[PDB]
Amino acid sequence: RSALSCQMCELVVKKYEGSADKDANVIKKDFDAECKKLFHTIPFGTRECDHYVNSKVDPIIHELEGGTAPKDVCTKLNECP
C-alpha cells in the first residue's frame, strides 16, 4: 500500500469493466498480468499484486457490479487514491 493502490484498482477494473468475460477469475488474474510485468521492477509490485487480486478485487468488483464507475470504486473502498 502507498505507491499504486489506486492504480491497481484501475487494473482489476480495467480488466473487469473491459473483460467481456464478466469473471473475477479471468480478471483478478488478468490484473496480476499487467501488475507483475508492469510492477515487475518493483520492490513490492508482484507482492502487492497477489495481495490485491484477493482482497481489493472482491470489493472493487463489488463497485463495478453495483453500478459504480471504475474511478469511484477504489475511492469508495478508501482505496483511491
TrEMBL record:
The answer to whether the entry has keyword Transcription regulation is: no
Keywords per UniProt? Disulfide bond, Signal
Q: Where is the Saposin B-type domain?
A: 2-81
What fragment of the full-length protein is this?
Answer: 23 to 103 of 103
Gene Ontology biological-process annotations: defense response to Gram-negative bacterium; defense response to Gram-positive bacterium
Q: List the disulfide bonds.
A: 6-80, 9-74, 35-49
Q: Look up the domain of life of the source.
A: Eukaryota
Signal is among the record's keywords: yes
What are the GO MF terms of this UniProt record?
channel activity
* UniProt name for this protein: Saposin B-type domain-containing protein
